[PDB]
Amino acid sequence: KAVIMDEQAIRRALTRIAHEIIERNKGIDGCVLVGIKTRGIYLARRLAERIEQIEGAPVPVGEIDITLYRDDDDEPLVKGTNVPFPVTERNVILVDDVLFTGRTVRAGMDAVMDLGRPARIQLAVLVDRGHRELPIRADFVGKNVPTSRSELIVVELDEVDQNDQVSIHEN
Amino acid sequence: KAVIMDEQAIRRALTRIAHEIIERNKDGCVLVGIKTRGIYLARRLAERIEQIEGAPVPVGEIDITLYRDDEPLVKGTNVPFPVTERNVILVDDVLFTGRTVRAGMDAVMDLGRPARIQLAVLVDRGHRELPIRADFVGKNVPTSRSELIVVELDEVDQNDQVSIHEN
Amino acid sequence: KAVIMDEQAIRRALTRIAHEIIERNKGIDGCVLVGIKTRGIYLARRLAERIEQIEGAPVPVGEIDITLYDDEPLVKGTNVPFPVTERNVILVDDVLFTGRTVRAGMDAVMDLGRPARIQLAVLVDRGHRELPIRADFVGKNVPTSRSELIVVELDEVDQNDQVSIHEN
Amino acid sequence: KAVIMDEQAIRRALTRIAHEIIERNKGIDGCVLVGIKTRGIYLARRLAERIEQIEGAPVPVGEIDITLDEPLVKGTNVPFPVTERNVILVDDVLFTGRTVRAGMDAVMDLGRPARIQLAVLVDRGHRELPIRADFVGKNVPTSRSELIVVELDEVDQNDQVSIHE
Numbered sequence: 001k002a003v004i005m006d007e008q009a010i011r012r013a014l015t016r017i018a019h020e021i022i023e024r025n026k027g028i029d030g031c032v033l034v035g036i037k038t039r040g041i042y043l044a045r046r047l048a049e050r051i052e053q054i055e056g057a058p059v060p061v062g063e064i065d066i067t068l069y070r071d072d073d074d075e076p077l078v079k080g081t082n083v084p085f086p087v088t089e090r091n092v093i094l095v096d097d098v099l100f101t102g103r104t105v106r107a108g109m110d111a112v113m114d115l116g117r118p119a120r121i122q123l124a125v126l127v128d129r130g131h132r133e134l135p136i137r138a139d140f141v142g143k144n145v146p147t148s149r150s151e152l153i154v155v156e157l158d159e160v161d162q163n164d165q166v167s168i169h170e171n
Numbered sequence: 172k173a174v175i176m177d178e179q180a181i182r183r184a185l186t187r188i189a190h191e192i193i194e195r196n197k198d199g200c201v202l203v204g205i206k207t208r209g210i211y212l213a214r215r216l217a218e219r220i221e222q223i224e225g226a227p228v229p230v231g232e233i234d235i236t237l238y239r240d241d242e243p244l245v246k247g248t249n250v251p252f253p254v255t256e257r258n259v260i261l262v263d264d265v266l267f268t269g270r271t272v273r274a275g276m277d278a279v280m281d282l283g284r285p286a287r288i289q290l291a292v293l294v295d296r297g298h299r300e301l302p303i304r305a306d307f308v309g310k311n312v313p314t315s316r317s318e319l320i321v322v323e324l325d326e327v328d329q330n331d332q333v334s335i336h337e338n
Numbered sequence: 339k340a341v342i343m344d345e346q347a348i349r350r351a352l353t354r355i356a357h358e359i360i361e362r363n364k365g366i367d368g369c370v371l372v373g374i375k376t377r378g379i380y381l382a383r384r385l386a387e388r389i390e391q392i393e394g395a396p397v398p399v400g401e402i403d404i405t406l407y408d409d410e411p412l413v414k415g416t417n418v419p420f421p422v423t424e425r426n427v428i429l430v431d432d433v434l435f436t437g438r439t440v441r442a443g444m445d446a447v448m449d450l451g452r453p454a455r456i457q458l459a460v461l462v463d464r465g466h467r468e469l470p471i472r473a474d475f476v477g478k479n480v481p482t483s484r485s486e487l488i489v490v491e492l493d494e495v496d497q498n499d500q501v502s503i504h505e506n
Numbered sequence: 507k508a509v510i511m512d513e514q515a516i517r518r519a520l521t522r523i524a525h526e527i528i529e530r531n532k533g534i535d536g537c538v539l540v541g542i543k544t545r546g547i548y549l550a551r552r553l554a555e556r557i558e559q560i561e562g563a564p565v566p567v568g569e570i571d572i573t574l575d576e577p578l579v580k581g582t583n584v585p586f587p588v589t590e591r592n593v594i595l596v597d598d599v600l601f602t603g604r605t606v607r608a609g610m611d612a613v614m615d616l617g618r619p620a621r622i623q624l625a626v627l628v629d630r631g632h633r634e635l636p637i638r639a640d641f642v643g644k645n646v647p648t649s650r651s652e653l654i655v656v657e658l659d660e661v662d663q664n665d666q667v668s669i670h671e
């Protein structure tokens with residue numbers, strides 16, 4: 001095990017991502033955040049808080065539930081959605097903690113597309129660890145973390161582990 | 172209305188892309204072309220790779236098009252090999268919003284369970300509307316929304332050329 | 339000509355750069371800002387103010403005067419009133435084009451001392467690099483043709499904040 | 507301590523970089539290669555041989571001798587003009603970027619090139635100056651403490667790249 005981001009690094013990466021989202025969309029008009037799974041939902045909320053602070057207006061947040069990577073043959077499935085607003089003609093930013101193969105994000109993208117025809121779908125992740133297996137990229141990235149295939153990235157968030165931290169495990 | 176790649180620039184981009192594919196994809200990989208122009212580039216890429224490595228590369232086809240209330244949809248496929256556990260490289264002429272590549276990716280996923288899907292395009296013109304990127308890119312060409320990129324290939328236009336139009 | 343950034347877009351880009359600078363360096367300990375030319379100096383000061391607001395300690399600012407005599411740019415003078423040795427120096431300029439101005443500025447900093455790191459922040463990167471130089475922090479990437487020109491107007495000296503493209 | 511590129515991976519990377527050099531410059535007109543230090547010179551010769559095979563014209567090759575703890579230029583054996591040329595510097599590894607900046611200064615003392623570009627076999631990160639390669643064989647992430655070692659046939663009698671310490 002080793003620690004690769006601490007609470008401060010995380011706070012700092014999220015704050016920069018928020019500015020980038022506002023910058024790239026010329027304000028938050030028409031933007032919604034949709035979080036993926038538990039940790040993604042927590043990050044999307046954090047991102048929404050910060051953007052409200054910065055711009056003075058709130059950002060809607062939505063949820064998508066997808067099967068687990070960890071706690072094993074797999075192909076991830078959307079269990080459910082909780083998006084209580086329209087997505088058509090909106091700029092939807094998916095949020096997740098780690099981008100690995102990209103297969104989870106693709107399922108989240110499909111779920112949004114079943115709900116509506118958004119203008120744009122964008123992606124924000126806290127960690128991009130490589131090993132992509134689909135042609136998918138994040139628009140906003142907190143840290144690029146190289147890894148070997150056998151390593152694991154674990155993101156601890158305050159809302160459930162009571163410390164904010166990112167670390168690598170050898171497996 | 173300007174020419175931005177000529178026959179020689181196109182030849183040089185494809186030859187570099189073929190070497191990149193081999194480097195990254197060191198066995199085999201397969202090529203699946205999208206629409207008429209994407210199928211011609213995949214064939215060209217396959218031919219270059221056999222010349223460089225001495226083995227053939229299988230090539231597959233996806234036919235895509237548009238229908239009314241907008242999104243592109245898959246008409247048919249001709250992939251005469253299994254895609255399961257394979258490294259599939261989608262090929263198209265231009266990456267724009269990314270919606271066409273997403274339909275092609277979806278078609279490959281119906282056929283099988285590949286190990287990997289990668290993307291090679293001759294031109295990436297920006298204005299992505301989905302979170303999609305190309306692994307291999309011939310040229311990044313900035314454009315405004317109102318411009319259009321037109322790729323002409325020997326096989327059907329009898330001149331190899333890439334140009335920008337407005338409208 | 340056309341307008342590609344306005345006062346609000348510029349403000350948002352500088353605010354974001356300031357947060358990236360802090361993030362990348364894990365706080366501003368040991369960091370100094372050195373602006374290049376008139377417009378680069380103004381941007382370095384703005385960045386310094388923002389960083390202070392964000393982080394509560396000030397950032398020293400320095401200046402380098404580059405003047406023009408392929409007409410190669412030359413360092414006229416410097417006013418860096420602190421040491422640069424073992425510091426992280428962030429050069430600041432208006433527009434990154436061929437990279438030749440930044441290379442002179444880099445050469446000036448290396449005469450003054452031996453820094454730990456030299457980094458670069460620019461408001462606009464317009465391409466056409468002629469030396470192997472890149473910016474660490476970029477406000478906006480703006481594609482251009484060789485013949486076009488990027489003009490940055492800052493409040494301090496033009497009374498309007500904006501960036502625009504001209505031809506010839 | 508691992509092998510990160512083998513002889514075949516090196517061969518392929520150089521072949522690809524050569525095609526990228528021709529593409530980016532639309533042929534080799536006005537292009538010269540200047541290698542840095544011993545290993546950079548060997549790579550520049552290899553690149554030049556590869557480009558001649560591909561385009562059927564030779565590419566001149568120059569040498570810059572750099573030493574050490576500021577790296578500084580001990581020698582410059584560039585027997586052609588550089589003014590208005592497209593000069594591609596070549597080295598084995600890009601680390602802090604300080605060696606490449608000394609090579610860039612040495613070329614600028616010789617004349618005014620149209621362009622200076624950079625080709626390296628390995629880019630290992632940890633830049634300390636705002637410098638990047640145009641052409642890169644492999645991006646290899648590393649920690650500050652690790653070391654990249656490049657072995658070439660001409661002087662080590664094996665072609666290989668590895669990570670050390």
Ligand SMILES: O=c1ccn([C@@H]2O[C@H](COP(=O)(O)O)[C@@H](O)[C@H]2O)c(=O)[nH]1
Nearest residue numbers: 069096098099100101102103104152153
């Ligand atoms: O090292 C990893 C890899 C994957 N995941 C989880 O799986 C998804 C990413 O894997 P993939 O679908 O991109 O392969 C994310 O939701 C992430 O939470 C991790 O938490 N850590």
Ligand SMILES: O=c1ccn([C@@H]2O[C@H](COP(=O)(O)O)[C@@H](O)[C@H]2O)c(=O)[nH]1
Nearest residue numbers: 264265266267268269270271319320321
């Ligand atoms: O400027 C353009 C835009 C689109 N297309 C064609 O339409 C699709 C555009 O992709 P997208 O907007 O769905 O990414 C591709 O098949 C491509 O052949 C072009 O040829 N040029």
Ligand SMILES: O=c1ccn([C@@H]2O[C@H](COP(=O)(O)O)[C@@H](O)[C@H]2O)c(=O)[nH]1
Nearest residue numbers: 431432433434435436437438439487488
């Ligand atoms: O389109 C341009 C080109 C150059 N410059 C000015 O010249 C320098 C950048 O040119 P270069 O030396 O990077 O080519 C900067 O100081 C910038 O202020 C511009 O403002 N706009």
Ligand SMILES: O=c1ccn([C@@H]2O[C@H](COP(=O)(O)O)[C@@H](O)[C@H]2O)c(=O)[nH]1
Nearest residue numbers: 598599600601602603604605606653654
């Ligand atoms: O891991 C390393 C680091 C440096 N160097 C050598 O020293 C210079 C390092 O570059 P830099 O620290 O000057 O960027 C290059 O010539 C290279 O030959 C290596 O070979 N491997």
